[PDB]
């Protein structure tokens, strides 16, 4: 039983929880309702177990993709912002927080991979992937390299793979077709073939992981990398004169990085649904509210139209939003589990030389489709 007449909120330890607590302190000044913010470890695994018994926090903040699971389990209240409130946020973010065609959380922030580059080594960053091979060759003469990113995790390599028609599950009209998997198609093959050939021509290395990539950019050894907003503070400490821009295009088509939308759901078992609604709609999701959290720890790009526009004056944040908008939303369905392992494996297989691109993705398609059906 969740205690009536107060608000318990759960948010991760890398978000601006002290900022959020100030928004709660204002809410208390206006309502007399005390707001408590907690950042317990593995809150994404804890919530399902406590909310099942009708306990847990009144509000939970996490990436949207987990919320489709919670919703199916019957742990989230169906929220009701009117048409006027929905106009205040970017419509594509509302697509991320739907279960069975119903809204189940309030979008807060937007997260996606961007092209980070060294201004001193590369003043004008390339707009296309095809441009890299030639650019690596003139940098190799100076002892540097063009591009180093995490080639081990499909999250980092997917933007290029997806660019020409690769996709996880077909998103028809508010419904994910679990039977329609697109890791086998011509676009995916072309994307992965290009990546493999970058390794084949020694522009990149098949066993470059997150740590090796990041260290090489921060030390000024590589001209560019592909990483998210979590990486910026490290580069600030390194004092690398750096920019964040739109990801390079493949075959005239934008990279499609996966989009993670930080979202706030209301616990279905909360006796404080109306209080939570008020807090989230009229207190947090305002310029002043989001600014309080942002000042504590930066939110990156936010879903609120008005505040994003003030944030986007920082080109790094504008680039994030741009790559996010041209990218694909992370499916909030359970069948995504199969996707991750199968695609991760296929890229390793193609990069190391164990399998060719064709068969590696053909097998990965088979493995996702049989796991999604039976």
Partner 1 sequence: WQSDALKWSVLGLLGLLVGYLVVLMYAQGEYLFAITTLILSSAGLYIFANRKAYAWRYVYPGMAGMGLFVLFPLVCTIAIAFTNYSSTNQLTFERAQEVLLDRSWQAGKTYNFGLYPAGDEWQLALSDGETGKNYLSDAFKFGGEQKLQLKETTAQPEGERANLRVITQNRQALSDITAILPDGNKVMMSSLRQFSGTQPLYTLDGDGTLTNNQSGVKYRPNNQIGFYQSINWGDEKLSPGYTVTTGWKNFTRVFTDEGIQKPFLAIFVWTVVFSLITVFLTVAVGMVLACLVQWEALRGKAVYRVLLILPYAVPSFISILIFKGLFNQSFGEINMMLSALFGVKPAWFSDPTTARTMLIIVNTWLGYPYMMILCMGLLKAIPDDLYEASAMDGAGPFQNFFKITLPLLIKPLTPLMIASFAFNFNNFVLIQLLTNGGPDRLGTTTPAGYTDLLVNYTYRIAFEGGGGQDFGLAAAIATLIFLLVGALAI
Partner 2 sequence: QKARLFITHLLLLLFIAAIMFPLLMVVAISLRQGNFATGSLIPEQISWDHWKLALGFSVEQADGRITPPPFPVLLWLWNSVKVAGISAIGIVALSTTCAYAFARMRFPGKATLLKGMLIFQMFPAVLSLVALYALFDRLGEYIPFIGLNTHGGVIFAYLGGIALHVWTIKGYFETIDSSLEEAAALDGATPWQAFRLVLLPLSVPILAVVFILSFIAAITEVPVASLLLRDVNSYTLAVGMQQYLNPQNYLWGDFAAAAVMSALPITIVFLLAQRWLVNGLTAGGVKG
- Residue 141 CB, shortest distance to partner 1, in Å, is 21
Binding segment toward partner 1, per CB under 8 A, in 187-195, 243-251, 307-315, 361-369: 361-369
Angle between helices 186-200 and 336-352 in degrees, nearest 10: 40
Is 114 near partner 1 (CB under 8 A)?
no
- Which entry of partner 2, partner 1, none binds 237, CB below 5 to 8 A by partner kind? partner 2
| Listed ranges 8-16, 111-119, 208-216, 249-257: which one lies at the site for partner 1 (CB under 8 A) | 208-216
Which CA distances in Å does 205 have to 15, 157, 276, 277, 348? 33, 13, 49, 49, 11
CB of 369 to partner 1, least distance (A): 9
CB of 273 to partner 2, least distance (A): 23
Q: Select from 113, 133, 122, 114 the least CA-distant residue to 220.
A: 122
Question: Is residue 133 close enough to count as binding partner 1 by CB under 8 A?
Answer: no
Q: Encode burial over 52-88: b for 16+ CB neighbours within 10 A, e otherwise.
A: eeeebbbbbbbbbbbbbbbbeeebbbebebeeeeeee
In the complex, least distance from residue 209 CB atom to partner 1, rounded to whole angstroms: 7
Q: Name the CA dihedral angle for 135, 137, 141, 143, rounded to a multiple of 10 degrees.
A: 80
When the beta carbons of 182 and 228 are compared against partner 2, the nearer one is 228
Q: HSE, CB side, 13 Å, CA atoms: give it for residue 137.
A: 7
Residue 241 touches partner 1, criterion: CB under 8 A: no
Measured distance CA(45)–CA(309) in Å, rounded: 34
Burial class for 230, CB neighbours closer than 10 Å (0-12, 13-18, 19+): exposed
Q: Is residue 367 a contact residue for partner 1 (CB under 8 A)?
A: yes
Q: Which residues bind partner 2 (CB under 8 A)?
A: 12-14, 38-42, 46, 49, 63, 210-212, 214-215, 218-219, 228, 230-231, 233-234, 236-238
Q: Which does 206 bind (CB under 5 to 8 A by kind): partner 1, partner 2, none?
A: partner 1
Q: Which of residues 308-337 bind partner 1 (CB under 8 A)?
A: 334-337
Sign of the alpha-carbon torsion through 70, 301, 12, 115: positive
Q: CA angle at residue 69 from 65 to 73, to 5 degrees?
A: 160
Min CB(235)–partner 2 separation in Å: 8
Contact residues for partner 1, defined by CB under 8 A: 30-33, 48, 52-54, 69, 72-75, 77-78, 80, 82, 100, 205-209, 211-212, 268, 274-275, 277-278, 334-342, 344-345, 348-349, 352, 354-355, 363, 366-368, 370-372
């Amino acid at each position: 039983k969740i205690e009536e007449g107060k608000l318990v909120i759960w948010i991760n330890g890398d978000k601006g929880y002290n900022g959020l607590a100030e928004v709660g302190k204002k809410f208390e000044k206006d309502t007399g309702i005390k707001v408590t913010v907690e950042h317990p470890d593995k809150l994404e695994e804890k919530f399902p177990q406590v909310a099942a018994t009708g306990d847990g926090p009144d509000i939970i903040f996490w990436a949207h993709d987990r919320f489709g699971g919670y919703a199916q389990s019957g742990l989230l209240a169906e929220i009701t912002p009117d048409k006027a409130f929905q106009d205040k946020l970017y419509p594509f973010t509302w697509d991320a927080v739907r279960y069975n065609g119903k809204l189940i959380a309030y979008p807060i922030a937007v997260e996606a991979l961007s092209l980070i580059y060294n201004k001193d080594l590369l003043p004008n960053p390339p707009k296309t992937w095809e441009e890299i091979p030639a650019l690596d060759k003139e940098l190799k003469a100076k002892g540097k390299s063009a591009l180093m990113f995490n080639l081990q995790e499909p999250y980092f390599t997917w933007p290029l793979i997806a660019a020409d028609g690769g996709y996880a599950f077909k998103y028809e009209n508010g419904k994910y077709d679990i039977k329609d998997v697109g890791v086998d198609n011509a676009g995916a093959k072309a994307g992965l073939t290009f990546l493999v050939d970058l390794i084949k021509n020694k522009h990149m290395n098949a066993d470059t992981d997150y740590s090796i990539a990041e260290a090489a950019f921060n030390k000024g050894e590589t001209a560019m990398t592909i990483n998210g907003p979590w990486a910026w503070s490290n580069i600030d400490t390194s004092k690398v004169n750096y920019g964040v821009t739109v990801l390079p295009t493949f075959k005239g088509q934008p990279s499609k990085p996966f989009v993670g939308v930080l979202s706030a759901g209301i616990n279905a078992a909360s006796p404080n649904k109306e209080l939570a609604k008020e807090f989230l709609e009229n207190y947090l999701l305002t310029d002043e509210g989001l600014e309080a959290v942002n000042k504590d720890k930066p939110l990156g790009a936010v879903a609120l139209k008005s505040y994003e526009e003030e944030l986007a004056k920082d080109p790094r944040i504008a680039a994030t939003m741009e790559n996010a908008q041209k990218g694909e939303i992370m499916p909030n369905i359970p069948q995504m589990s199969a996707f991750w392992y199968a695609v991760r494996t296929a890229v390793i297989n193609a990069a190391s030389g164990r399998q060719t691109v064709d068969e590696a993705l053909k097998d990965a398609q088979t493995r996702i489709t049989k796991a999604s059906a039976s």
